[PDB]
């Protein structure tokens with residue numbers, strides 16, 4: 001099926017490359033035409049203008065720096081985009097994606113927002129994941145196409161969901177990485193490398209990952225059992241982590257922030273509340 | 286051979302240790318400062334000794350599990366004479382320094398000493414996959430491997446007795462972090478009526494992808510060479526700011542993203558735009 005890709009930066013080039021290696025007829029457009037050279041070699045058709053590109057296909061994928069750019073670029077092509085399917089894999093906020101979808105509704109444009117959770121060299125590779133939201137009709141119908149980039153997880157019809165889920169997952173990434181590097185910092189004061197530390201974390205993360213189904217259940221039922229010792233002892237642990245961190249000779253930022261946060265849930269509840277009770281603390285802005 | 290073991294201290298964790306010993310056929314002698322705690326284990330065939338000294342003399346390996354190293358020291362100091370010649374395994378939780386203190390005392394009296402740290406709850410003693418960190422006497426570890434393997438999965442870390450506690454705390458840091466952040470995400474998604482149980486599969490998958498980033502981050506962390514093409518510190522700081530702001534927009538707290546934003550952005554403010562996330566380690570060191 002004939003498909004168009006607007007934006008040929010590192011990620012947009014990767015999205016088109018994968019459509020092409022599966023033998024889709026791939027029309028492309030980029031502001032800097034130079035970047036479509038390798039792709040047009042392997043057999044893409046480069047439009048002269050964006051309008052031109054849009055007219056070439058019933059599916060349009062867009063991947064550019066941000067939604068202000070997307071807006072500036074698609075707004076003029078609203079008339080040309082009527083009746084076509086639009087898949088926006090630009091990264092931005094829930095609100096921007098919702099606005100896009102609104103915009104797309106009034107101009108009779110089927111609209112699927114997505115957020116890519118891998119690097120360009122990871123497109124078409126196993127373990128690539130794209131979160132998707134907006135038009136279900138666009139998702140099924142183009143599911144084959146989407147699956148060339150990775151596992152496509154359709155989340156629902158609110159086009160904001162992809163961005164929202166993404167940012168929640170990114171939160172876990174940033175958190176996990178900082179805590180890794182704090183662990184490596186600390187064991188470093190004892191001549192253990194990050195790479196000798198690494199296998200233990202790999203093992204330990206498996207155990208942690210087994211903990212979360214129970215944490216999730218409780219967070220939802222609101223019944224906070226004490227399967228990790230209860231807040232009292234985990235708060236004391238964090239404190240001891242912070243104190244031992246200083247003692248060995250590094251900073252205490254990571255433990256400090258976590259201490260403050262778990263400690264707070266100790267106030268609004270009991271000593272024998274599980275960690276799961278911490279959701280309740282975050283819900284109150 | 287299922288040789289005779291003593292357990293001193295029979296709170297929930299100490300009692301769980303003793304029960305696994307009994308359940309692998311070890312003749313188990315127990316002591317607690319209050320006798321009735323030993324009720325269920327004596328019905329299961331533990332021998333409850335009259336005193337700590339009697340307990341210590343029954344067995345050639347002594348396991349102690351009490352609330353802290355202060356109580357441990359108050360208990361074991363008088364038994365120095367009695368413990369001399371025997372193996373002592375200390376699964377009390379505490380600091381690296383407390384464990385190094387206990388090791389140095391133990392060496393003074395010729396007490397072979399292994400310090401450990403249990404990384405599960407009582408309920409998970411005797412389950413494989415429950416993790417134990419052991420540090421101290423290589424002799425005791427290999428000589429009583431079969432014993433330690435009753436309680437779960439033994440990770441022997443080296444000769445320094447404080448290592449078990451050091452790693453425990455580092456790894457616990459990672460569990461606290463992942464739980465904090467996962468519930469932050471759960472609460473964020475709850476503003477659109479998505480439950481934590483719906484979110485969980487998406488996290489469990491992403492966790493796999495996150496684990497696969499660490500080898501590379503580990504390598505950079507060790508080398509000092511933070512320059513990246515993927516995981517640009519600058520764009521990640523903006524990612525974090527974006528997450529904080531979407532958080533108050535959807536109408537929850539921001540304490541988790543904000544605390545991280547601060548830390549990463551502090552490194553961006555004194556490193557290089559070119560840096561990758563591994564560079565954080567330089568900032569945590571100061």
Ligand SMILES: NC(=O)C1=CN([C@@H]2O[C@H](COP(=O)(O)OP(=O)(O)OC[C@H]3O[C@@H](n4cnc5c(N)ncnc54)[C@H](OP(=O)(O)O)[C@@H]3O)[C@@H](O)[C@H]2O)C=CC1
Nearest residue numbers: 007008009010011012031032063064065069090091116119
């Ligand atoms: N790369 C990654 O690892 C990831 C990327 N993303 C998202 O993918 C999107 C694109 O990223 P990436 O390809 O790496 O970035 P690049 O900077 O490599 O490319 C950005 C694209 O935007 C275009 N563009 C920029 N400004 C304008 C403008 N004013 N008018 C029209 N087009 C414009 C560029 O055209 P030109 O070449 O002429 O500048 C280029 O095609 C972003 O939303 C990013 O967050 C999502 C997940 C991770």
Ligand SMILES: NC(=O)C1=CN([C@@H]2O[C@H](COP(=O)(O)OP(=O)(O)OC[C@H]3O[C@@H](n4cnc5c(N)ncnc54)[C@H](OP(=O)(O)O)[C@@H]3O)[C@@H](O)[C@H]2O)C=CC1
Nearest residue numbers: 229294295296297298319350351352353356378403405406
């Ligand atoms: N349980 C958990 O979730 C986890 C536990 N740990 C660590 O394991 C350790 C063992 O905890 P656990 O034994 O189950 O806890 P408890 O506090 O329930 O029991 C403490 C033990 O020490 C004795 N004791 C307490 N205070 C004194 C005192 N002042 N003088 C003399 N003896 C005293 C108690 O006797 P009595 O029964 O008479 O009070 C009991 O034998 C802790 O340090 C904990 O941090 C590690 C991982 C997780």
Ligand code: NA
Nearest residue numbers: 375376377401
């Ligand atoms: Na210990």
